């Protein structure tokens, strides 16, 4: 990894983790992509061939039930397809087609059941992915996921118009840039991964919230850092500033992580409920931590494509 991009702290203090179910994700996701006809057989094969977003997810949502990880993996593959459609609409100036897709996604997000077989396979695949994600936790969690994802769709829309007018956001085979738009969604998905919808009071506790924010912000700043040196294909001090912000996300997270785990201790009051909430907080925070190493190494490995 380039010295300019290297993070000795991540390498030393954030050991990579891999979900035990990882080996089984590939074939299932391939089957799903082909079944929903999300991409032509050959495009599926390319995406399924090497590194893909499932690898990011499998180093992140540790402890997730197998079915939850599978659902998240398929959702991440859907993201790849959406990104491709997004780019294509932009390149071809298909403003109408994009606007209509934007509308259908908002609609399918709130009502996936009656969109499972939409003529647009991207929408059909989206609806199925969301339906499956909605099957794990109570409707209150589903509604929050939806609330957050509506915002993500609008972020893509903003980008569509920016890029349509010559503004270059950041090509990259397996970019993380647009994925960071879904920062609240990744945070939401920690919950079905530990099997509990956290009460507002717990997930809005300052230590939990801050840990969650910093985990995601790290990836945003780091994506900035990795983009700068590509300018070649002032600079040194521009990198310097972004680098300090990346390092600050990490050290700030380490501090708030300690606070979050103390909070978890407090939740474990001896009752089964306390034990469940405590365990879920610890698992979620642990995965907020795993995000650092998963992102860091995913970027490095993606550079081989």
CB of 38 to Cl ion, least distance (A): 10
Question: Does the footprint of Hg ion cover residue 222 (CB under 5 A)?
Answer: yes
Site string for Cl ion, 181-220 (x = CB under 5 A): ----------------------------------------
Tell whether residue 231 is among the known ligand binding residues.
yes
Tell whether residue 252 is among the known ligand binding residues.
no
Q: Which burial class, exposed, middle or buried, applies to 251 when counting CB atoms under 10 A from its CB (0-12, 13-18, 19+)?
A: exposed
Q: Quick one: which of 177, 210, 245, 300 contacts Hg ion (CB under 5 A)?
A: 245
Q: Quick one: which of 183, 243, 282, 299 contacts Na ion (CB under 5 A)?
A: 183
Ordered DSSP codes for 213-272: HHHHHHHHHHHHHHHSGGGG--HHHHHHHHHHHHHHHHHHHHHHHHHHHHHHHHH-SSSH
Which residue's Cβ lies closest to Cl ion? Answer: 48
Site string for Cl ion, 8-37 (x = CB under 5 A): ---------------------xx-------
Kindly report the length of the chain: 305
- What is the maximum span of the chain, computed from C-alpha positions, in angstroms? 60
Residues identified as active-site: 79-80, 181, 304
Ordered DSSP codes for 41-69: HHHHHHHHHS--HHHHHHTTSTT--HHHH
Q: Which does 196 bind (CB under 5 to 8 A by kind): Cl ion, Na ion, Hg ion, none?
A: Hg ion
Copy the structure tokens of residue 56: 């990011």
Based on its alpha-carbon atoms, the radius of gyration of the chain, rounded to whole angstroms, reads 19
| CA 93 distance to own-chain centroid | 27
CB of 52 to Cl ion, least distance (A): 6
Q: Quick one: which of 75, 156, 222, 297 contacts Cl ion (CB under 5 A)?
A: 222
Closest to 78 measured CA to CA, from 152, 128, 144:
128
Question: Does the footprint of Hg ion cover residue 160 (CB under 5 A)?
Answer: no
CB of 229 to Hg ion, least distance (A): 10
Q: Which of helix, strand or coil describes residue 199?
A: coil
Nearer to Hg ion, 156 or 222 (CB): 222
The rounded distance, in Å, linking the Cα atoms of 110 and 148 is: 12
Nearer to Na ion, 38 or 211 (CB): 211
| CA 231 distance to own-chain centroid | 26
Nearer to Cl ion, 103 or 206 (CB): 206
Interacting positions 159-178 with Cl ion (CB under 5 A): 176
The answer to whether the CB of 250 falls within 8 A of the CB of 7 is: yes
Interacting positions 230-269 with Cl ion (CB under 5 A): 245, 248
Instruction: Name the one residue in this structure whose structure tokens are 């907080």.
Output: 281
Count of residues in contact with Hg ion, rule CB under 5 A: 12
Q: Quick one: which of 80, 160, 184, 297 contacts Na ion (CB under 5 A)?
A: 184
The answer to whether the CB of 223 falls within 8 A of the CB of 176 is: yes
* Host H or E run for residue 127: helix 121-133
Tell whether residue 42 is among the known ligand binding residues.
no
| List of residues contacting Hg ion (CB under 5 A) | 48, 52, 54, 196, 222-223, 226, 245, 248-249, 276, 299
> Which residues contribute to the site for Na ion (CB under 5 A)?
183-184, 216
Please report, in range form, the residues annotated as the binding site for Mg(2+). Answer: 83, 87, 223, 227, 231
Known binding-site residues equal 83, 87, 223, 227, 231
């Amino acid at each position: 990894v380039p010295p300019s991009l290297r993070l000795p702290v991540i390498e030393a203090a954030f050991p990579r983790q891999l979900h035990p179910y990882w080996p089984k994700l590939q074939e299932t996701t391939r089957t799903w992509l082909l079944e929903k006809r999300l991409m032509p057989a050959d495009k599926v094969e390319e995406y399924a061939d090497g590194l893909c977003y499932t690898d990011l997810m499998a180093g992140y949502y540790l402890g997730a039930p197998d079915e939850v990880l599978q659902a998240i993996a398929d959702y991440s593959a859907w993201f790849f397809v959406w990104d491709d459609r997004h780019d294509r609409d932009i390149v071809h100036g298909r403003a109408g087609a994009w606007r209509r897709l934007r509308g259908l996604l908002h609609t399918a997000l709130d009502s996936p059941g009656d969109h499972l077989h939409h003529e647009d396979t991207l929408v059909a695949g989206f609806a199925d992915s969301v339906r499956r994600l909605y099957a794990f936790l109570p409707a209150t969690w589903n509604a929050r996921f939806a609330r957050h994802f509506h915002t993500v769709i609008e972020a893509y829309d903003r980008e569509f118009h920016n890029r349509t007018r010559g503004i270059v956001p950041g090509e990259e085979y397996l970019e993380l840039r647009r994925l960071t738009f879904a920062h609240w969604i990744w945070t939401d998905l920690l919950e079905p991964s530990s099997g509990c919808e956290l009460p507002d009071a717990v997930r809005k506790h300052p230590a939990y919230r801050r840990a969650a924010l910093l985990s995601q912000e790290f990836a945003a700043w780091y994506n900035d850092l990795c983009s700068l040196p590509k300018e070649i294909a002032t600079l040194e001090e521009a990198i310097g500033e972004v680098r300090r912000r990346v390092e600050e996300c990490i050290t700030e997270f380490l501090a708030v992580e300690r606070d979050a785990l103390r909070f978890a201790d407090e939740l474990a009051d001896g009752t089964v409920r306390g034990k469940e909430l405590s365990g879920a907080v610890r698992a979620n925070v642990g995965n907020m931590r795993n995000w650092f190493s998963s992102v860091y190494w995913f970027h490095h490995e993606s550079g081989r494509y």
